[PDB]
Design a protein around this ligand. Structure first.
Ligand SMILES: NC(=O)c1ccc[n+]([C@@H]2O[C@H](COP(=O)(O)O)[C@@H](O)[C@H]2O)c1
Ligand SMILES: NC(=O)c1ccc[n+]([C@@H]2O[C@H](COP(=O)(O)O)[C@@H](O)[C@H]2O)c1
Lengths: 465, 464
């Protein structure tokens, strides 16, 4: 089982002896320090429920921690007393209060997103002990944010080239399951992407959403049948056509994606799909199109040549915006080399060549769920206020060599400005009541989740515009 | 955990795409052709935690059936196939996995492990588990990147001190908060511990002892250390009090004290260097003060810090001619360190004549998070199938990218006469023109057939 006493950075075990004597309170906060100008706050609710709520302290876990740390530090520095107190006083429930903005909220950089403080003067050391666990929320936040920023690009070009945003939620598919660092990461990352889109091949995200957020529909994400290199190459190089025919025939009534670059993407599109099996394609339903899938070469150049080829072998129409459109039974999915940067290049390149963004959907894996760091949005957790000797003290850091690492001072609160923007008031100035109500809500207190959100609410909060 | 729900969605639809009359699907994993050799580590963890024993149950099958029915809006799930495995093998997977020993250091472009079904009815199972097995790229990459950094550290420590004492402690893992999840933290931390012994991510410890085991009393260690909150809590005008309180609380053990809260240079020169100097020069070699800068240009900061300390404390020159701080005073750079800057820092220290003995490093996100599967081009591909009872050598070869070509047929790994490695394709390993295949069966029909202790892994991964 998971032991919260063992889920922190090793040195935090020695911190209770480092605070000023008679410190009864430690107050800390998380922010995405000051392009990603606005961030999607999502993921905390998962961590609270899975790791922090309920009886997380037991006699066993304490003993286990005692032994582990004794060897790790080659000494007994573990705060056994402190934990026994929580076990005995609160029945293993954590005496801390957490306030946060609603899950899914879109908040500009440099603002307080959530705060942590102890509710018992005895557990002044508990606030920062759980920094490590709570800080990992940077990941679902960063994934959701990066995913949302790509949706903006897609939304912009789709609107421009088609006149509407139909199907936008299916324009960027999650292909990152094998590309992430672990199973737990796959679930968290995939759920973050689902906040903005509906297409995913990382099934793990579904279960996480159901269990920790919940949705009205029986499922938050969908997928379609699709081939991979093994199912095509297995037929032997001279039988790629046989493979294609067999696959589109097995999935004749549902959308089907078929990777076509095993040997020569251009020959596959022009001769096999465009000639040898054209009759099996033009006969398909608009609800069950063939989705050709290139998977190599320069992303933009490949997509353009593919479209040029298909346009020469299939009927092409021009929509009301003046952009070329493949027939309804035929589409393309670019699932290689796609990241927020190249995505922009591809749709822009398509527009210049007069191809509607309607013709192509995208897939992204590692770049979507793995090539992300806590530094992209500068997620940071810092102590800004303590009470020692019964007196409040506003604390902060301000490294001389880096003004960007400066932190906020005192008790904080988030407010809406008259012009509809946001501001984080420091030093308790929020009490002045000049900016309406603080936007953070208590979501956790003394072992209980006091406020939560359904995934439908999160999605609503994260919408664009 | 349900293995029937631990694969890329589309693989659920593959059993109907393979050529009819296919009785076998054989696939392999490689770190396709800096980073010329990789450390094979991690597969054993995945086999034990996710693939061994009864992994199929009536419940798990029904659960997947319903999930996929809604996910696909159609019942494409292969309930019959999974049910077959449940009744025939009591939920044990009919697959065989062969691999090089855990910890092996292998050149790029070589087969590292292979997978194949052992029951003709389960030809589709081989690639069903590709997703879960492919995630081994992570520990492989962490271990590899960490080992390359140890090489750099080794080169400069030896060059500037004459030996390699304490090498396994020169790079500390600070990545707990910087990774994407709890599970990732444990996996990555254990990968790092293959090369070093210092870590702040305790989860790595539990993973090691449970999945590999060690006859070791100290697989991973750590020392008392302050953070910004414990220093800044005292108030800006009391940083000195915080420092004095901390060093006295940990008077007899090594202690790391972050010193850049306000002005790292003032702390080194005035506080540690003057006001509290009496509390430092009195410490023992086994309980040094470890000053930790945490901001600014990593190389420039370290050099200015050493220059400052050199002026306030007695400096010696070792037998190699490099300057050395007193035994009770050291430095740890735990910000902005990665494989590239690490190299710039030690080279910069060497030019200014400072022994690498003076400084140790810490790395978080760059160590366990800023890494991807394409760093070593980790890939899983099918190279052989049996259809209509005839073997067929399989492979891909995209016209737009020769780097994506895969190997053909049955593979085997052998040592060459000159002591190198070669991957023999198309079953040629059978000719016996080389020695024994270096891959070993580590998994077969639900059972882990060969295991390695973390001590063997460390041995296999050693340097030089
Ligand atoms: N349904 C699908 O076509 C599907 C699902 C998961 C991964 N993939 C492929 O796997 C690879 C993963 O690599 P990346 O992490 O770079 O995306 C890509 O080539 C991707 O297209 C495809
Ligand atoms: N014992 C320690 O000093 C210790 C442990 C864990 C993290 N840290 C700090 O946490 C931060 C982690 O951030 P990065 O992911 O960018 O490495 C660093 O500033 C690092 O120094 C320090």
């Amino acid at each position: 089982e998971f032991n919260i006493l063992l889920a922190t950075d090793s040195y935090k075990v020695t911190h209770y002896k480092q605070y000023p004597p008679n410190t009864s309170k430690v107050y800390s906060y998380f922010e995405c320090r000051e392009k990603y100008e606005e961030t999607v706050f999502y993921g905390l609710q998962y961590i609270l429920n899975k790791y922090l709520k309920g009886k997380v302290v037991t006699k066993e876990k304490i003993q286990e921690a005692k032994e582990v740390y004794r060897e790790h530090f080659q000494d007994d520095v573990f705060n056994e007393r402190g934990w026994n107190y929580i076990l005995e006083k609160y029945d293993g429930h954590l005496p801390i209060e957490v306030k946060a903005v609603p899950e899914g909220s879109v908040i500009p950089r440099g603002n307080v997103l959530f705060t942590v403080e102890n509710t018992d003067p005895e557990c002044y050391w508990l606030t920062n002990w759980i920094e490590t666990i709570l800080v990992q929320s940077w990941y679902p936040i960063t994934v959701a944010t990066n995913s949302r920023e790509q949706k903006k690009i897609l939304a912009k070009y789709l609107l421009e080239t088609s006149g509407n945003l139909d199907g936008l939620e299916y324009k960027l598919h999650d292909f990152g399951y094998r590309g992430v660092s672990s199973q737990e990461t796959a679930g968290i990352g995939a759920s973050a992407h689902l906040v903005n889109f509906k297409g995913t091949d990382t099934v793990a995200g579904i279960a996480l959403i159901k269990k920790y957020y919940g949705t009205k529909d029986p499922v938050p994400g969908y997928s379609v049948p699709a081939a991979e290199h093994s199912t095509i190459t297995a037929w032997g190089k001279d039988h790629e056509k046989d493979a294609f025919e067999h696959i589109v025939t097995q999935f004749s009534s549902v959308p089907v994606s078929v990777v076509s670059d095993s040997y020569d993407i251009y020959n596959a599109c022009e001769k096999i799909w465009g000639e040898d099996l054209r009759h099996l394609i033009v006969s398909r339903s608009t609800e069950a199109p063939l989705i050709i899938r290139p998977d190599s070469g320069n992303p933009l150049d490949t997509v353009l040549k593919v479209l040029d080829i298909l346009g020469k072998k299939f009927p092409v129409t021009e929509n009301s915006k003046g952009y070329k459109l493949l027939p309804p039974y035929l589409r393309v999915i670019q699932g290689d080399g796609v990241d927020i940067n190249t995505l922009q290049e591809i749709v822009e390149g398509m527009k210049q060549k007069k191809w509607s963004i309607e013709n192509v959907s995208f897939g992204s894996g590692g770049a979507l769920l793995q090539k992300l760091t806590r530094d992209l949005l500068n997620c940071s957790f810092k102590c800004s206020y303590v009470v020692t000797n019964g007196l409040g003290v506003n604390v902060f850091k301000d490294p001389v060599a880096d003004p960007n690492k400066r932190s906020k001072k005192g008790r904080l609160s988030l407010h809406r400005t008259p012009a509809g923007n946001f501001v984080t008031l420091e030093e308790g100035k929020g009490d002045l009541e000049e900016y309406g109500h603080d936007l953070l809500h208590t979501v956790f207190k003394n072992g209980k989740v006091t406020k939560s959100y359904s995934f439908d609410e999160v999605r609503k909060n994260a919408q664009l515009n």
